[PDB]
PDB file of C-alpha atoms in Angstrom:
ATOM      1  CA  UNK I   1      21.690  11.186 -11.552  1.00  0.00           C
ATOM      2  CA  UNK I   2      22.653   7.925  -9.415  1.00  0.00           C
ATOM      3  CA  UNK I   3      20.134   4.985 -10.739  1.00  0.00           C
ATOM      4  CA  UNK I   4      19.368   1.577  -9.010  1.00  0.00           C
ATOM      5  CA  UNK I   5      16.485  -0.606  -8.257  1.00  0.00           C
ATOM      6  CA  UNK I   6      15.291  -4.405  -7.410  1.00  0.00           C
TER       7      UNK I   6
ATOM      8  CA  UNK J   1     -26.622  -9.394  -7.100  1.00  0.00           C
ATOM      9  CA  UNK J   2     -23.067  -8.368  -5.873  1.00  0.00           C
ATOM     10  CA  UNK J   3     -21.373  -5.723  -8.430  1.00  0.00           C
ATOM     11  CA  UNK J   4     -17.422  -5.703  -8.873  1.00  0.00           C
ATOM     12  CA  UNK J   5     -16.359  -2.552  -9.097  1.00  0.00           C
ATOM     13  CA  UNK J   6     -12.682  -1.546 -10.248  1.00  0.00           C
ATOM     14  CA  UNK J   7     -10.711   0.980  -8.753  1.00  0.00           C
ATOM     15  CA  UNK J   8      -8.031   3.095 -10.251  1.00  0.00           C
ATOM     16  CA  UNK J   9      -5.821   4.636  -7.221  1.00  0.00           C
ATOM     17  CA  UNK J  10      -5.279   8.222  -8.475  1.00  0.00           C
ATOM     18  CA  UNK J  11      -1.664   9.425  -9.401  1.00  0.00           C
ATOM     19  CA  UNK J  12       0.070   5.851  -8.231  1.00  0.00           C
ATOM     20  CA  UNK J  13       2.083   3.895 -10.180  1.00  0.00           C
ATOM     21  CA  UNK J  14       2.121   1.043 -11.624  1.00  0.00           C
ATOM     22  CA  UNK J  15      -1.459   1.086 -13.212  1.00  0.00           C
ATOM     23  CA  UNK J  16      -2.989  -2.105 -10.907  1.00  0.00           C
ATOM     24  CA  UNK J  17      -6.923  -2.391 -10.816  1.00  0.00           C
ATOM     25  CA  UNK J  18      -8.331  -3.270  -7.437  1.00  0.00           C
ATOM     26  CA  UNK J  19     -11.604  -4.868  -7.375  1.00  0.00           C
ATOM     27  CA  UNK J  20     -13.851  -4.732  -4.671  1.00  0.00           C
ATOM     28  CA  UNK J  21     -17.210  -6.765  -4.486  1.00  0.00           C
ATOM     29  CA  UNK J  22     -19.972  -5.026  -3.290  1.00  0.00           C
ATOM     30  CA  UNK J  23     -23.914  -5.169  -2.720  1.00  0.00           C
ATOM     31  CA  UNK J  24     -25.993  -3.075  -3.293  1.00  0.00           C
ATOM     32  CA  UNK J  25     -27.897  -4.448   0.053  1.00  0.00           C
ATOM     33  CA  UNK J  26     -25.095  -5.040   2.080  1.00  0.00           C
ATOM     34  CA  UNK J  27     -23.557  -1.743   2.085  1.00  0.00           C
ATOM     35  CA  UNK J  28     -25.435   0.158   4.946  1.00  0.00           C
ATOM     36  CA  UNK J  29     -23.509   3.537   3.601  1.00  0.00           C
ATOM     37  CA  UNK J  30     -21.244   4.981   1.647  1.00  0.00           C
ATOM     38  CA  UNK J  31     -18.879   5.550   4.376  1.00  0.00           C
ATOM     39  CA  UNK J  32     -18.518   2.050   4.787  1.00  0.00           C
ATOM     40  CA  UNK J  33     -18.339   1.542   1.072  1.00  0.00           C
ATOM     41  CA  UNK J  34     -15.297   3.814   1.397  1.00  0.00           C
ATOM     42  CA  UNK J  35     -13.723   2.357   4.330  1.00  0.00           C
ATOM     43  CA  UNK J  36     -13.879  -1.280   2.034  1.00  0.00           C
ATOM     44  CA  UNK J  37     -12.051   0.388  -1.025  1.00  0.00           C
ATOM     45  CA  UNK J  38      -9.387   1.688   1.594  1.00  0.00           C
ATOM     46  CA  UNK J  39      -9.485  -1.671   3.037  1.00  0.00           C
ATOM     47  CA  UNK J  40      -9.036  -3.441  -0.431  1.00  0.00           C
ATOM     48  CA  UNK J  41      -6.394  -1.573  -1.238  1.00  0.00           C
ATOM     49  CA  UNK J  42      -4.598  -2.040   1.642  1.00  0.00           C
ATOM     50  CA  UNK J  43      -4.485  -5.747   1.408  1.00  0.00           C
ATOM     51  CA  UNK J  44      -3.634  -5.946  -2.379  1.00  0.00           C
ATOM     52  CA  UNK J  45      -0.057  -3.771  -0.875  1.00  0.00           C
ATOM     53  CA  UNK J  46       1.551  -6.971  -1.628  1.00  0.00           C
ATOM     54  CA  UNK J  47       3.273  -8.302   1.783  1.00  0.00           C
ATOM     55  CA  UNK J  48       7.171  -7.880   1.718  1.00  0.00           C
ATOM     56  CA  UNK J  49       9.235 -10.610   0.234  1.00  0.00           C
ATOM     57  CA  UNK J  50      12.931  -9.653  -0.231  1.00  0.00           C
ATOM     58  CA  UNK J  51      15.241  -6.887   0.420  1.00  0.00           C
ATOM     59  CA  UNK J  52      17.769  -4.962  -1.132  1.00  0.00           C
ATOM     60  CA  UNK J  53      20.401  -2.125  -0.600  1.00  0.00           C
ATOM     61  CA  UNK J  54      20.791   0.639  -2.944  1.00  0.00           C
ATOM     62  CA  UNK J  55      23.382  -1.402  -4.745  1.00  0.00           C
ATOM     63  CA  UNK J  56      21.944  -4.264  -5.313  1.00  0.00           C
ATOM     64  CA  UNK J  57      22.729  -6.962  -2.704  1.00  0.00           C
ATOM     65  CA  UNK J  58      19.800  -8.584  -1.132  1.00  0.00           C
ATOM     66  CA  UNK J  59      19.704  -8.360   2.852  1.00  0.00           C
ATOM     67  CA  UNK J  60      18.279 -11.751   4.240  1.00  0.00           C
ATOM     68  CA  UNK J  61      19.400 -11.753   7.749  1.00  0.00           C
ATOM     69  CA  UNK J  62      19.601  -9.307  10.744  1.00  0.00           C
ATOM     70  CA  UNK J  63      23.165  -9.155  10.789  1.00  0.00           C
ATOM     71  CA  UNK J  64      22.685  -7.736   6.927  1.00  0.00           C
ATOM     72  CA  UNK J  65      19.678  -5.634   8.282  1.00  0.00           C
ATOM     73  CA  UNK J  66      21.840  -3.829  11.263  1.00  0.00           C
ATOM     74  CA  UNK J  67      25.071  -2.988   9.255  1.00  0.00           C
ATOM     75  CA  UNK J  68      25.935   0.715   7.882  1.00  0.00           C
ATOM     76  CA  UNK J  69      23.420   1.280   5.511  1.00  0.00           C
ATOM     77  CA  UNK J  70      19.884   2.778   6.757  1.00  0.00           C
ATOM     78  CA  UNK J  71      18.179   2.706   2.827  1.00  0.00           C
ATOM     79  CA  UNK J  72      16.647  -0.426   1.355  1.00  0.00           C
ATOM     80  CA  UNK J  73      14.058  -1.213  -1.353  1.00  0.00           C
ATOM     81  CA  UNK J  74      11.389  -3.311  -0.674  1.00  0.00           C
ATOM     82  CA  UNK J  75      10.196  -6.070  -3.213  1.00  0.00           C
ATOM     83  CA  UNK J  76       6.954  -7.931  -3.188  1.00  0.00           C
ATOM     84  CA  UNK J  77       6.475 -10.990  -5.137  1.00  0.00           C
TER      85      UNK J  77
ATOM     86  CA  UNK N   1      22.720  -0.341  22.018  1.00  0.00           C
ATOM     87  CA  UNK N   2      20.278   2.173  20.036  1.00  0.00           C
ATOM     88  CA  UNK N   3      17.161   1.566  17.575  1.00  0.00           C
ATOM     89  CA  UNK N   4      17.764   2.422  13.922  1.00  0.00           C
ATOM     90  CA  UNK N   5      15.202   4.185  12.052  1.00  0.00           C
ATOM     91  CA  UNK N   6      15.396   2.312   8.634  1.00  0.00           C
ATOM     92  CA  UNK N   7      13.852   4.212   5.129  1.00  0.00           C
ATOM     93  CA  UNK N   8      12.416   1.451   2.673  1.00  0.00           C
ATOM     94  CA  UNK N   9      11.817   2.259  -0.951  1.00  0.00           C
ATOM     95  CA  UNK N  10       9.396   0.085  -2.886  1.00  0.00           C
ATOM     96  CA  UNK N  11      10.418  -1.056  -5.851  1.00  0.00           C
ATOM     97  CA  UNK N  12       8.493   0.469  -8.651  1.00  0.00           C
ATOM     98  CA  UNK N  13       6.557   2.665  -7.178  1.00  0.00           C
ATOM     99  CA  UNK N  14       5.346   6.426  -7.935  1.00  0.00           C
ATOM    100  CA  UNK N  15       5.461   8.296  -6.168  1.00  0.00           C
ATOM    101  CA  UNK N  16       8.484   8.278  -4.461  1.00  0.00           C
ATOM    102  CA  UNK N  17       7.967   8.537  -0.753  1.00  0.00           C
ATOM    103  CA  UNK N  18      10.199   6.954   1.831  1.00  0.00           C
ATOM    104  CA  UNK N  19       8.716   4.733   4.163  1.00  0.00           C
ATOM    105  CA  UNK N  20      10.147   4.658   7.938  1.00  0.00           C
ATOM    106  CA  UNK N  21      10.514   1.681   9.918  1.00  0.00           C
ATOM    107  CA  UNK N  22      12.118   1.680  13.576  1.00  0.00           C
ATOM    108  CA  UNK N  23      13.266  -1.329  14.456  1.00  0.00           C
ATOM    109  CA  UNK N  24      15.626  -2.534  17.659  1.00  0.00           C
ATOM    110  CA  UNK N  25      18.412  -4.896  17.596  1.00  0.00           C
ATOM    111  CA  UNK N  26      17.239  -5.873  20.321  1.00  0.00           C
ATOM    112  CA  UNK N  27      13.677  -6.026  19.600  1.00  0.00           C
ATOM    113  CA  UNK N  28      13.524  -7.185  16.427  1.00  0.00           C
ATOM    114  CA  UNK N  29      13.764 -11.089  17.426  1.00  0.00           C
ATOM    115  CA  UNK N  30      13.701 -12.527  13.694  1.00  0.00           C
ATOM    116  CA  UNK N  31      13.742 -11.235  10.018  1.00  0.00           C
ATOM    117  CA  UNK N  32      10.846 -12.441   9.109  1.00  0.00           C
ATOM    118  CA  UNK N  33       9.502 -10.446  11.281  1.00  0.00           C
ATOM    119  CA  UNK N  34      11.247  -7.560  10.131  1.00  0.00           C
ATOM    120  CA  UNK N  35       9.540  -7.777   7.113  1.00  0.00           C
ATOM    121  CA  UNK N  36       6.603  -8.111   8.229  1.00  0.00           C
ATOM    122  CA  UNK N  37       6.661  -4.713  10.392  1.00  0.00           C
ATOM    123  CA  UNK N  38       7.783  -3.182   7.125  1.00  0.00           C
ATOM    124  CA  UNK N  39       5.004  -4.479   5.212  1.00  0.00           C
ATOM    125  CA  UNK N  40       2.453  -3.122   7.867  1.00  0.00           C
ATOM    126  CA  UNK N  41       4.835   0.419   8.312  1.00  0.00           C
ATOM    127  CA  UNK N  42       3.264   0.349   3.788  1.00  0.00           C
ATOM    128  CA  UNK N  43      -0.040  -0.582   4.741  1.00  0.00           C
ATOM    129  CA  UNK N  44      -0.426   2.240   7.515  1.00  0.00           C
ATOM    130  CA  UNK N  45       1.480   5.069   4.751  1.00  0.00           C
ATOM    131  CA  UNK N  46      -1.888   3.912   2.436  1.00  0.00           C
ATOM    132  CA  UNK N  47      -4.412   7.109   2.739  1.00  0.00           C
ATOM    133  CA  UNK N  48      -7.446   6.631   3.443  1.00  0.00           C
ATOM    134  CA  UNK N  49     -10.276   7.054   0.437  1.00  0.00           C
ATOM    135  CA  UNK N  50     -12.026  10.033   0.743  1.00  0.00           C
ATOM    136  CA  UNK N  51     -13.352  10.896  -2.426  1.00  0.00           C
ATOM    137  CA  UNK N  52     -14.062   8.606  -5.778  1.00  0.00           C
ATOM    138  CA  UNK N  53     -14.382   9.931  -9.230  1.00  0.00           C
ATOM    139  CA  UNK N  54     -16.187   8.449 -11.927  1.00  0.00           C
ATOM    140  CA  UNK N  55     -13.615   8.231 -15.184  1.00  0.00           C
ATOM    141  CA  UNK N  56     -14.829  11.753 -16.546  1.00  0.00           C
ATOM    142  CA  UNK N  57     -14.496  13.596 -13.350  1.00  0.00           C
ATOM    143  CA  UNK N  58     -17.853  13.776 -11.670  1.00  0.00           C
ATOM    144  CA  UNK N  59     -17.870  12.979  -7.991  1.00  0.00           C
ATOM    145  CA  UNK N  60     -19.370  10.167  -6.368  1.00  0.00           C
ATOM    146  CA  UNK N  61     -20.854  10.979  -3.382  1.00  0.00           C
ATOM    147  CA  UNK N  62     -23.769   8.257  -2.541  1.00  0.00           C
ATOM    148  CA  UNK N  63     -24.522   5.269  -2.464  1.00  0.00           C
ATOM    149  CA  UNK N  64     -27.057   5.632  -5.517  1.00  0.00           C
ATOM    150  CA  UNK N  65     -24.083   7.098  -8.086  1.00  0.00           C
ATOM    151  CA  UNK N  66     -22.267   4.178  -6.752  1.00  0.00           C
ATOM    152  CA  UNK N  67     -24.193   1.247  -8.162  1.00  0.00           C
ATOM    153  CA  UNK N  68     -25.267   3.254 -11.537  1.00  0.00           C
ATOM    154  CA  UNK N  69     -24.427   2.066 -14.920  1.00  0.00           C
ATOM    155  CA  UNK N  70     -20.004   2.848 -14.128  1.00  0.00           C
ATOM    156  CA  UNK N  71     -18.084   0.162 -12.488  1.00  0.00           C
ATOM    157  CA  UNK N  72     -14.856   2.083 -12.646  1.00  0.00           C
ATOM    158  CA  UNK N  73     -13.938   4.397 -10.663  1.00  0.00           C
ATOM    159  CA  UNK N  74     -10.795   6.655  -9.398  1.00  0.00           C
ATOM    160  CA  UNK N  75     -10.228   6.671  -5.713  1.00  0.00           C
ATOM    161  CA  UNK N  76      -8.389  10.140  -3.938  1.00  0.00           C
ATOM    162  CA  UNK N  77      -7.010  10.292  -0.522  1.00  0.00           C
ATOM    163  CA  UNK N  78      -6.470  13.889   1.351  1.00  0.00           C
TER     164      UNK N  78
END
């Protein structure tokens, strides 16, 4: 599961 | 005397209050009591500061904004 | 020249639903601008209130529940 953010 | 009342926006997250002042002479109905929660939530959406892609880099111009990639985040403040 | 139909993802926040934006190269005549059609394209996704709930799950439906002893309350769109 890919996971990214800001 | 004006009562602030807190509102808890069911099943969003983060947990934010939004408060809403309100009196009890003022408000002709409870439509329009309504229609100011929806309104006082609307403005405490906090206005769109910065940019990113998926990966990470910030987009701060419209040349960044028109390349390949059609997904960005949004950050507030 | 054609418009691009842009999805923004806030950061942070649940639930996940993709906002779209469509914006035109040729329209689009600064980024801060940009931004600021992307801040109203979240506003206008914000439902509307149609219901509040007091914290233990009774309905308020008048303007008499609403200024009773609570001053919390749980607002539900559609």
């Amino acid at each position: 599961p890919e996971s990214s953010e800001g | 005397r004006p009562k602030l009342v807190t509102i808890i926006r069911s099943g969003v997250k983060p947990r934010k209050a939004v408060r809403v002042l309100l009196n009890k002479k003022t408000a002709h109905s409870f439509e329009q009591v309504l229609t100011d929660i929806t309104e006082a939530i609307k403005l405490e959406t906090g206005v769109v500061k910065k940019l990113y892609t998926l990966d990470g880099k910030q987009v701060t111009c419209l040349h960044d904004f028109f390349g390949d990639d059609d997904v960005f985040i949004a950050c507030g403040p």
